[PDB]
């Protein structure tokens, strides 16, 4: 370990990729960029497995080096580009648009989108600091740096982005009556309404959230990602609509 690691063994790959343990000895290490190593899905994984457009890494290169895949509004030619959250994924040759969303099974699922709703994106602010020259800027969960923002854009809120222009369209305050989709631990993919926000002076903020079906659970403030205001979502949720069937129903529905 004299320097950065470039390989990634298959067994050490993040679990929610579901790489077969006998397929090979290696896993595609996602190149650095917007999203972390374990909060992202490499572009090769999306095409080969989730969509079956390519059957091996050889054929993923031919698709991507043909300049045929658009991440956000830009077009990426990196086979291991890290695609994480609701960052849109557009394939104009097949005339289809997907959004990389979570689901209740702690997995990345591609939500189909229309062309008019694939032109926008929701970003979660991470910090707001004063730059040099008293120029404020915000850093989003995507990793974008945005110049002079609205003064009400605080640390933990959510904003709507216009992909073609990069402007800010709509912002949602992080309050105690707004929808949120969890992105962290056991709540991964769950959608509910914030009902309580308790703070500990030293370590963490723990948020109590009530599910649409009346279920209640808790998570750390890090995993909260506000989707909309007043139980109304700005994005189309996956098929389960952020509702976790408590075990028995999932087992019974798989039998049927």
């Amino acid at each position: 370990a004299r320097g950065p690691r470039h390989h990634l063994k298959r067994l050490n790959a993040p679990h929610h990729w579901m790489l077969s343990k006998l397929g090979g000895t290696f896993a595609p290490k996602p190149s650095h960029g917007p999203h972390g190593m374990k909060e992202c899905l490499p572009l090769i994984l999306i095409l080969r497995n989730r969509l079956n457009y390519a059957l091996n890494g050889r054929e993923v290169t031919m698709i991507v080096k043909n300049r045929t895949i658009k991440i956000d509004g830009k077009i990426r030619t990196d086979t291991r580009y890290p695609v994480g959250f609701m960052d849109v994924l557009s394939i104009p040759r097949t005339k289809e648009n997907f959004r990389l969303m979570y689901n209740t099974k702690r997995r990345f699922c591609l939500v189909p989108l229309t062309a008019e709703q694939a032109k926008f994106k929701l970003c979660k602010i991470e910090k707001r600091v004063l730059g040099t020259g008293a120029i404020p800027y915000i850093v989003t969960h995507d990793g974008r740096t945005i110049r002079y923002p609205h003064p009400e854009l605080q640390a933990n809120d959510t904003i709507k982005l216009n992909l073609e222009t990069g402007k800010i369209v709509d912002f949602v305050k992080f309050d105690i009556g707004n929808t949120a989709m969890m992105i962290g631990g056991n709540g991964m993919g769950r959608v509910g309404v914030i009902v309580k926000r308790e703070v500990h002076p030293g370590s963490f903020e723990i948020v109590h959230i009530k599910d649409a079906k009346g279920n209640t659970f808790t998570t750390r403030l890090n995993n909260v990602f506000v989707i909309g205001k007043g139980t109304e979502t700005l994005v189309n949720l996956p098929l389960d609509k952020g509702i976790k069937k408590p075990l028995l129903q999932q087992v019974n529905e798989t039998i049927k």
Partner: peptide, 26 residues
């Protein structure tokens, strides 16, 4: 060009309208 105010005036477009909603502050 790009550099020449095609970008740079933005940096005075951007700047200026910022000091507007920083001055409402009410």
């Amino acid at each position: 060009k790009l550099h020449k105010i095609a970008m740079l005036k933005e940096a005075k477009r951007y700047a200026a309208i910022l000091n507007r909603y920083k001055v409402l502050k009410a």
